[model samples]
Target: SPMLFDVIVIGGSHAGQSAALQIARARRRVLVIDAGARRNRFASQSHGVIGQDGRSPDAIAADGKAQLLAYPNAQWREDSVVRAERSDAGYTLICASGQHYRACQLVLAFGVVDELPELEGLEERWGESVFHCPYCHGYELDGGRIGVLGSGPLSYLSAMLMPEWGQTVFLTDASFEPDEEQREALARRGVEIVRDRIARIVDRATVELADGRRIAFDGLFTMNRMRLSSPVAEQLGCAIEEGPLGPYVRTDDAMETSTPGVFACGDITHRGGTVALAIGNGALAGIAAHRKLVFG
Candidate 1:
């Protein structure tokens, strides 16, 4: 038998946790389903977050879980939501473990995974010596050598931001061309501009150029193509948008999806997603879900 919940939140990362907190505080029966995989697992520290700017994501989750446990009606399911369907009352959440949960409203917070360009030896060094979020890793490697591999506009953005932390920063142009203004900006910031096709990132220490040149760098940053972790939004017939990066679910002001009783937040609905933004959006969704049930 499946337990009935007032609100079911998919993905227990920052977004889902924020939604759960709001729903639980509203005295609604809430269940949070998490696959135990977060995009920030490789990040040693999370920055730009208020109060707990430098806290580890693991520690943040642990503390959040503890706080949510204090609410007797709030439940945590450490499993992935394999499928979901619209029900007369609302929706049914099916877990990978074969368990099912029913809820009047659903909040999807499943984050995306970065898709890196096909480069030799780069996949293995991801997150350890290679990173994505400059706000998180910049201060840690301040005054050290940093390399920004060309990944489109993100390459230029990374190069511009890296100067705030590192003394020696280099932006590699492998597939794209830099404009005169961009080049001048880099020069003003004292960032080196390298024109070479990237062959591979070696042990986070060296970047092998296609021309047989190797440049040593202490850290490497690249913007990866992030894809949604789940296809539920599309499968459930929710409205979607083809954004600059990829497809994202179409959501309303309150984070409600096109489908009635279905809501989405975080990276699944927004471009250039951030943990802080996800948290805020999730909180709004949770509150909206609770209000819908309470008022109607």
Candidate 2:
């Protein structure tokens, strides 16, 4: 027999943990399923989260799990959910370990998977010397030489904004050509533009050009495509919307998904979120789910 839960939250990171904490506080049985892989795992430390600034992501997650364990109705499972299906009760979830669980409501807080560019040595320094969001990492690299890996107009815009944090260099690598007006804009901002093909990232702080020119910088920035970490929301017929980076599960203001009784939060739904924003979204989703169960 499967264990029945009032709610099942898929993911145990900031978003999932925040949502589970809410339901548990309401004296509801909530199960959090995690596979131990978090998107921020590549980053050594998490920033922009108040009070937890500069803390390692692992430590933050550990504290969250410990706090959740204080709730008698809250449970944690270190396993991946292989499948999720709509059922008469609400939802049926099958785990990779062959365990089954039933829930009256579902919260999908699974984060997204980053699709980094195929640059030699780039992956090796990801989240440490290479980053995506300026706000998340810009402070530490402030006043340092910064390099922007240009992909498109978005990359150009990102490069333009880089001057705010440090001396900026835009490396197009022949991937994108900025218009005359764009060139003027970059020049006005004192942003240097390099059109050489990059051979690889070397020394963690230097970019080697294909023509043998090496540009040294303190950090690198890029915008990569992101995909949903789990497809359970889509599998259960929840509506998805296309984002700037990729597709994400669509949800209303309350974090309620198009599929009734199902909610989504965190990077899976919005790519432009920090840890604090994810936590806030998860908290809202949790409250909404609890309210729906009690009043509806």
Candidate 3:
């Protein structure tokens, strides 16, 4: 028997979870297949979310999942989607275990992985003292010394934004060779720019230069180049574009992909990684998917 679903959502993170919840509320048969690799898995606490602000990421997700499961039409499967094929009516998705499922529409919410620098010792400190997403960690490090761990123009942008939380923001990596004009501009803005490769970053601080120079800070920020995890869209000849963060699937106002019946949301379409925005986008994308079925 071919078990068919009205919508099949990939990635059980904030985006996929939200979409599945909405689809089920609409009385649609929905299946959310999750690889269990959420983008925010590394964070200790998630802030800036209204009521759930300052809550642990797992706690927030558990509460949301509990409420969403109350709907009868939604089913969750803890498996990774290995392949997908499009038909005239919809698409057929296959899990890594070879189980097959069909859906009238597909929502790819597979979040991206942050590609960090090749510097030694960075891997150990990443997602800890060395962080990403200013909005997520900025307020906590407010009024204290902070380090921006990237090179070139992006570092300048980081320096520009960090001052809102801390007065002394240090930009590292000798790779960042700001032009004289840019340096003057940064100096005017009160940013301490340092041109040196970061040897290592630890809980205490960042170790830079050969002289064992240490820049102490409450938190650190780094630039990460991101790319989509799913190749299904591209494999199906879907159009993609160079987004603000990196290359992503091209989507329309309804969050529909260039491919008619397919849609994308969350970090796959945007640079920002806030759960609020991810959930909102997921809801809108799910509504759009439902409207197509209703109006067609």
Q: Which candidate is the best by lDDT?
A: 2
Per-model TM-score on C-alpha atoms: 0.91, 0.97, 0.94
Identify the candidate with maximal TM-score: 2
Looking at candidate 2, the ten consecutive residues that score lowest on lDDT are 268-277
Each model's lDDT comes to 0.81, 0.92, 0.79
lDDT of 1 by residue, 56-146 (tens): 8899878888898799999998998888898686788788899988988888888887888777877787777787777767677757888
Tens-digit lDDT track for model 3 on 1-296?
A: 45799999888888888878888899999888888777787878998788888899998888878787899889888888888888885898888877899999888888788787766766677666677777888888757888777655676788877888886565557676777887787788789877666776655555555557777788777777777887877866678888655787778878888877787888887543788888888888888888876776
- Model 2: how far is 126 from its true place, Å? 0.5
Ranking of all predicted structures according to lDDT, beginning with the best and ending with the worst: 2, 1, 3
For model 2, residues 1-296, the per-residue Cα lDDT tens digits are: 99999999999999999999999999999999999998888888899999999999999999999999899889999999989999887899999999999999999998889899888999999998999888989989869999999876678889899999999999997899999999999999999999998999999779999999999999999988889888798899999998877889999999999999999999987643689989999999999999999986
Error of 3 at 288 (Å): 0.2
Question: Which TM-score value belongs to model 2?
Answer: 0.97
Ranking by TM-score: 2, 3, 1
